Design a protein around this ligand. Structure first.
Ligand SMILES: Nc1ncnc2c1c(C#Cc1nc3ccccc3[nH]1)cn2[C@@H]1O[C@H](CSCC[C@H](N)C(=O)O)[C@@H](O)[C@H]1O
Length: 278
């Protein structure tokens, strides 16, 4: 891995500044970090407390247990509602504050869960997916807009991977938000998480945006993520660990540590141990 000297990683897609012509249970780690990042940002904004997290497409959702235990141990009052047609990981069983729902959501069912949660704050996390086609994605993203227009969450994190330019169909619309980059994504994934705080204006996505995404993400996965951050004071200086480190320092802990590095190391250790990563 070519060596590089960096002050910070790319945290949002907008920050990628160049382009190029296109672990065990790593998937749970990718979800866990981005959702710890998203929910920790909401905690900083004082809006996570008293909210209800509605996670659609949450199964098996092994990592969600770590998320709940994290905020439960910080004293943050959160109710979870995990909805999926598939059965969740049994490690999510027996938690009074976690509600498991075995159902594929449609418009009608989004209306009813809104009814039963209103007027409580809703935080939406979506990871629904139906290799997928461009029509599958357009259906998925429409459904996610339908989640926002009906559930009207105070914040959302949405699965967001633009369709490839060579499989384009039609321009579509997605919510405004920051496009959060995911460490420990698959080697050449172009998926981000669309993070939005609502104070919902939609954005047109065009075929040129699909070209910009494909090239920016390829540069990120070929060049950026294969670097060693040699100034990085950490047991592992590979970029994805550099990237994970900067996400993890937005996380709160009841425990006190002598240094920030000691805090990130403890958190990473905790996360890997629960996910059974060496
Ligand atoms: N409507 C839904 N509601 C809820 N969950 C849904 C869906 C959905 C769909 C659909 C669909 N196709 C249609 C075709 C025609 C008409 C209407 C249609 N509607 C898929 N999923 C779940 O998304 C997960 C992705 S992996 C997450 C991984 C997870 N985040 C983890 O932590 O491991 C899977 O577990 C899957 O079961």
């Amino acid at each position: 891995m070519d060596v590089v000297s960096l002050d910070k990683p790319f945290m949002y897609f907008e920050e990628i500044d160049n382009e190029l012509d296109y672990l065990p249970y790593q998937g749970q780690l990718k979800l866990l970090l981005g959702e710890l990042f998203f929910l920790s940002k909401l905690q900083r904004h004082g809006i996570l407390d008293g909210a209800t997290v509605v996670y659609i497409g949450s199964a098996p959702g092994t990592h969600i247990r770590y998320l709940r235990d994290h905020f439960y141990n910080l004293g943050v009052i959160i109710k979870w509602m995990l909805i999926d047609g598939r059965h969740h990981d049994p490690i999510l069983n027996g938690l009074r504050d976690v509600t498991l729902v075995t159902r594929f959501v449609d418009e009608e069912y989004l209306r009813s869960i809104k009814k039963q949660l209103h007027p409580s704050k809703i935080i939406l996390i979506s990871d629904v997916r139906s290799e997928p086609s461009t029509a599958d994605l357009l259906s998925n993203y429409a459904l996610q807009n339908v989640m926002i227009s009906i559930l009207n969450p105070v914040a959302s994190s949405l699965k967001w991977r633009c369709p490839f330019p060579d499989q384009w169909i039609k321009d579509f619309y997605i919510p405004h938000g920051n496009k959060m980059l995911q460490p420990f994504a698959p080697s050449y994934s172009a998926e981000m998480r669309l993070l939005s705080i609502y104070t919902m204006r939609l954005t047109r996505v065009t075929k040129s945006d699909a070209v910009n995404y494909e090239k920016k993400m390829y540069y990120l996965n070929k060049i950026v993520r294969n670097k060693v951050v040699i100034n990085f004071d950490y047991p592992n200086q590979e970029y994805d660990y550099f990237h994970m480190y900067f996400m993890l320092r937005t996380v709160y802990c009841n425990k006190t540590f002598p240094t920030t590095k000691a805090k990130i190391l403890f958190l990473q250790q905790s996360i890997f141990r629960f996910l059974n990563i060496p």
